[PDB]
Design a protein around this ligand. Structure first.
Ligand SMILES: Nc1nc2c(ncn2[C@@H]2O[C@H](COP(=O)(O)OP(=O)(O)OP(=O)(O)O)[C@@H](O)[C@H]2O)c(=O)[nH]1
Ligand SMILES: Nc1nc2c(ncn2[C@@H]2O[C@H](COP(=O)(O)OP(=O)(O)O)[C@@H](O)[C@H]2O)c(=O)[nH]1
Ligand SMILES: [Mg+2]
Lengths: 428, 426, 20, 153
């Protein structure tokens, strides 16, 4: 009855979506050729008799990764024209992705979204995958979000952004692109989850003892997190939460809507046998500083709202005992105006492990989403970098020649200053 | 979808282009006959960037050849891999430049540009949409420099929104090759600084040293140096032909590297470079490549990076490797050598990864840097120009074709302004 | 020299068996 | 006599090399099929493929890949013949070898399964209507050969 539409933009979005869709197929038992040898209607449609097609859209200006997906194994699954490409990419240029190249393809993307929404009856909302530091993943994502907000508005919108790391960073104009896209999407987004690459590298190394991790492993972890998020809609449990109540429980202020995700427990087969994974133990482990997936130290901030999504063989009495112990713990401190800050959801479907992966099979899992004030330090560092580059007016001529004025840079700087001031005021 | 057209001019340009086409045709598994003899379907998925189909399974390179004498054209036509070039793409004159910039740029260029432009326009319109241009020439030549400058001006006048990549050689610091090297070098630089987008500088002393020491080849012939330059070219352009983990095309590199419109001179590098014998006693891994790229002896431009500060560094990796190792190596090299990087710009390193290693190896990388050490080259060129121009030596060969002292003064002023800019951005 | 090169995508997303 | 294993290994190596160029093989098949019309009946025999070869189809690479496929077929036939020379379950497995490698034999409905994913790389229409059997012929023969060797030893 309830349906969700996923949109993947850019290389990172396309690859993460590919991983999560193969995980979805494995969980639901649908063969890669589309033939299944009654609860999959949320993500999979029906084509006449015996064929199931996913409800997703893949968008990228460059045709390389989309062509690889079309040629790959999952070609008898995706609709032939649900995959949209172009000729030239944005190439780390927000102006190119926002003004010049995307305006001849946003119309087609919107037409396909409308056609997909026509099929559904109980549409819930959209999930958008992109990256802040990429030209297309910033500009085209902002354009698509503004067009969707204009067209529909009422339906909720959620994002899974890859937050650039403070130290391990790839491109050079990432602060410019991130500042511009944040200033554009602050007024249109509803709740944007945050993950990072260096944090996941550290988690993978320290826990699974893998010397040479890779993007495939990172995308598998992200797909596990997304599946844990959507399990409440996909299956039925003792206490399930939908996509509408997430924003209400996690967003206390109109512009403070930047939570972060956490997953536990993550271990390998060698440590799986010599360990007793209990509800209290995993709940305690989910709070340690060296387990979250955003590179920041939680003792520099205070928690505001925490969402717990237990998954598998879970007992409410020991869940409540673990929550009470965590509340009694003195090292973790909360904000004064939030007497109650816990949302608990339980599902009866144990996590599913992809064969040949680096994740051992378990019985319980905890996915945690936290809204905290520690993001102020990250925003401070990012705008300090922006100011340092913009003092000399470097790399500005590309944006100027593509159709942008320095007024946009000034306005974005002012908006980020205002947001940092809002965080500083709210923290006390 | 992304078509690249290649332009050649002069003796050095023609020879380097022949070697480059040989290497590229080897990469895609195309025999000198003209028929596909590959082994995987990945090789012909993107054969449209550099080749055109014709009749039954015959691929012809999309190249234009320009010269004033039929000598090197006949030599390359009678040599190996000479039966794949289109016979209609050989354009040549009859007189010759004779190491004169004025003759190439004012006298015979006028009668050659019409035909070469007609051919280039036909090749450009043959496709659906272009991506950019490439050019291999010599700054210090007589016909290559003038003809390439005139062509660059014409194309930039006609196609004003496409990238232009030039792979030009530069005068050697120790021993020159022509007496009038600084005049042509200065005029070519003055035109290139304004009519291009990114220029890669290559020397000959660096290639001589590399071929003498790394491969212990006691007979360094131009074939080997041209092969090295072609390998660098392929390493630069490989991302537009094969899938990878983190793609990065030419426009992406241009956006990420050049911060100011006039600071667009790069100097490349390559890795690994090991001998035939000592190859057995070395472990080929990512740390070895990271150690090898950041060295003065492994670069193809005769300059010392220790004398200047790096602005932006772009490294393109090929083969199967982990992103974590690359990230840790780049962070380590940026953190332990903070004295060699500018501070007002953070994250001086851009990384790209492909998945098809070069034939005969397992993993390789290409280094491209934009440093402040080009000021030494430009300062030496300007000093030589002033020293010769004070006595008006060899100048009567230029005024006899249409030149004037004003052009020389303006070119010297432009060099002084550019070197002052590089000095003051330090 | 034989060519034994294949992309990382094809060697990772192999058709896994369907569970019961 | 524990000596045909080398021939089997060479055959499977060449089959792997051909499986890499499967896509070009399908393109050549489609081009020659369009050139020779008869587009209402899918491929049913190897002799039909040989006739499509003999018909002017050109394009060089098409002839190369089709010649490679026919060479694999000929070597498989030779192996079916020689396994009896080197000497009930083995008998009818060899009978299946002979009857499948025989040129005049319907192969439109032939299919392969796990671990062979050759049919997953085809588009829906071609997989269910045109080229289901041709790409699924060699792996079945190789599996039969390995099973027969397993019974023999
Ligand atoms: N975790 C993860 N991050 C990825 C992956 N692929 C790309 N990224 C991130 O994405 C960033 C590049 O941004 P993108 O917008 O995706 O690059 P793009 O799609 O080519 O867009 P343009 O570069 O502007 O053309 C890199 O710095 C990576 O950190 C992936 O598979 N997994
Ligand atoms: N690396 C390399 N350099 C060359 C080659 N041929 C010529 N050169 C360089 O080109 C310079 C001579 O310029 P030249 O092309 O003869 O002038 P032009 O004929 O008027 O264009 C010399 O300094 C050489 O170093 C070659 O095959 N390889
Ligand atoms: Mg992109």
């Amino acid at each position: 009855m309830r349906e969700c539409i996923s949109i993947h933009v850019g290389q990172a979005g396309v690859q993460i979506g590919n991983a999560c869709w193969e995980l979805y197929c494995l969980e639901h038992g649908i063969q890669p050729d589309g033939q299944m040898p009654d609860s999959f209607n949320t993500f999979f449609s029906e084509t006449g008799a015996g064929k199931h097609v996913p409800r997703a859209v893949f968008v990228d200006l460059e045709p390389t990764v989309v062509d690889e997906v079309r040629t790959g194994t999952y070609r008898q699954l995706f609709h032939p024209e649900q995959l949209i490409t172009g000729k030239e990419d944005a190439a780390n240029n927000y102006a190119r992705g926002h003004y010049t190249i995307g305006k001849e393809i946003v119309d087609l993307v919107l037409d396909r979204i409308r056609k997909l929404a026509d099929l559904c009856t109980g549409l819930q909302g959209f999930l958008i995958f992109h990256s802040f530091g990429g030209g297309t993943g910033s500009g085209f994502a902002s354009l698509l979000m503004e067009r969707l907000s204009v067209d529909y508005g009422k339906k909720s919108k959620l994002e899974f952004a890859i937050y650039p790391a403070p130290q391990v960073s790839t491109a050079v104009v990432e602060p410019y692109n991130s500042i511009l896209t944040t200033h554009t999407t602050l007024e249109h987004s509803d709740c944007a989850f945050m993950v990072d690459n260096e944090a996941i590298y550290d988690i993978c190394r320290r826990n699974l003892d893998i010397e040479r991790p890779t993007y495939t492993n990172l995308n598998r972890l992200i797909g596990q997190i997304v599946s844990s998020i959507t399990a409440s809609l996909r299956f039925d449990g003792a206490l399930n939460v939908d996509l509408t109540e997430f924003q209400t429980n996690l967003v206390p202020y109109p512009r403070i809507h930047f939570p972060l995700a956490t997953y536990a427990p993550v271990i390998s087969a060698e440590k799986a046998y010599h360990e007793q994974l209990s509800v209290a133990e995993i709940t305690n482990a989910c709070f340690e500083p060296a387990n979250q997936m955003v590179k920041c130290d939680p003792r520099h901030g205070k928690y505001m709202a925490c969402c717990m999504l237990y998954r598998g063989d879970v007992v409410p009495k020991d869940v409540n005992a673990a929550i009470a112990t965590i509340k009694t713990k003195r090292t973790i401190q909360f904000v004064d105006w939030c007497p109650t800050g816990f949302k608990v959801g339980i599902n009866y479907q144990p996590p599913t492990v992809v064969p040949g992966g680096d994740l051992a099979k378990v019985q319980r899992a905890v996915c945690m989403l936290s809204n905290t004030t520690a993001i102020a330090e990250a925003w401070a560092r990012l705008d300090h970098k922006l100011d340092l580059m913009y003092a000399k007016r470097a790399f500005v001529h590309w944006y100027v020649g593509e159709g942008m004025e320095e007024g946009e840079f000034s306005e974005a700087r002012e908006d980020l200053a205002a947001l940092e001031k809002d965080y500083e005021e709210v923290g006390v | 979808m992304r078509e690249i057209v290649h332009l050649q001019a002069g003796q050095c340009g023609n020879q380097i282009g022949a070697k480059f086409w040989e290497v590229i045709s080897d990469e895609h598994g195309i025999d000198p006959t003209g028929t596909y003899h590959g082994d995987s379907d990945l090789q012909l998925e993107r054969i449209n960037v550099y080749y055109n189909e014709a009749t039954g399974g015959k691929y012809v390179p999309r190249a234009v050849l320009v010269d004033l004498e039929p000598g090197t054209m006949d030599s390359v036509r009678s040599g190996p891999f000479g039966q794949i070039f289109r016979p209609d793409n050989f354009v040549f004159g009859q007189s010759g430049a004779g190491n004169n910039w004025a003759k190439g740029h004012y006298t015979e260029g006028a009668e050659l540009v019409d035909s070469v432009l007609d051919v280039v326009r036909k090749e450009a319109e043959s496709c659906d949409c272009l991506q950019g241009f490439q050019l291999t020439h010599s700054l210090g030549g007589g016909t290559g420099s003038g003809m390439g400058t005139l062509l660059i001006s014409k194309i930039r006048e006609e196609y004003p929104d496409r990238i232009m990549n030039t792979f030009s050689v530069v005068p050697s610091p120790k021993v020159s090759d022509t007496v009038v090297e600084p005049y042509n070098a200065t005029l070519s630089v003055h035109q290139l600084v304004e009519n291009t987008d990114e220029t890669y500088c290559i020397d000959n002393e660096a290639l001589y040293d590399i071929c003498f020491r790394t491969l212990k080849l006691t007979t360094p012939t131009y074939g080997d140096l041209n092969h090295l330059v072609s390998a660098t070219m392929s390493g630069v352009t490989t991302c537009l032909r094969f899938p990878g983990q983190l793609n990065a095309d030419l426009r992406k590199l241009a956006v990420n590297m050049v911060p100011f419109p006039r600071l667009h001179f790069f100097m490349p590098g390559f890795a690994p470079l090991t001998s035939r014998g000592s190859q057995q006693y070395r472990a080929l891994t990512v740390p070895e490549l990271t150690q090898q790229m950041f060295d003065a002896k492994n670069m193809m431009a005769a300059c010392d990076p220790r004398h200047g500060r790096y602005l932006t560094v772009a490294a393109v990796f090929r083969g199967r490797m982990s992103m974590k190792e690359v990230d840790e190596q780049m962070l380590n090299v940026q953190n332990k050598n903070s004295s060699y990087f500018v501070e007002w710009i953070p994250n001086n390193v851009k990384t790209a990864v492909c998945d098809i290693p070069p034939r005969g190896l397992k993993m390789s990388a290409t280094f491209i840097g934009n440093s402040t050490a080009i000021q030494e080259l430009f300062k030496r060129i300007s000093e030589q120009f002033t020293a010769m121009f004070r006595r008006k030596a060899f100048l009567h060969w230029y005024t006899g074709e249409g030149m004037d002292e004003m052009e020389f003064t303006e070119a010297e002023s432009n060099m002084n302004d550019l070197v002052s800019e590089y000095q003051q951005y330090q | 020299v034989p060519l034994e090169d294949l992309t990382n995508y094809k060697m990772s997303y192999v058709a896994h068996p369907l569970e019961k | 006599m524990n000596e045909v294993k080398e021939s089997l290994r060479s055959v499977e190596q060449k089959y792997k090399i051909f499986q890499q160029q499967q896509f070009t093989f399908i393109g050549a098949l489609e081009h020659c099929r369009e050139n020779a019309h008869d587009k209402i009946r899918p491929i049913s025999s190897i002799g039909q493929v040989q006739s499509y070869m003999e018909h002017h189809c050109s394009n060089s690479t098409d002839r190369r890949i089709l010649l490679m496929f026919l060479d694999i077929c000929s070597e498989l036939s030779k192996l079916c013949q020689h396994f009896e020379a080197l000497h009930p379950v083995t008998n009818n497995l060899l009978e299946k070898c002979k009857t499948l490698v025989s040129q005049s034999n319907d192969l439109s409905s032939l299919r392969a399964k796990y671990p062979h994913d050759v049919v997953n790389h085809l588009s829906c229409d071609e997989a269910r209507n045109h080229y289901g059997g041709v790409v699924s012929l060699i792996p079945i023969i190789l599996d039969l050969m390995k099973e027969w060797v397993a019974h023999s030893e």
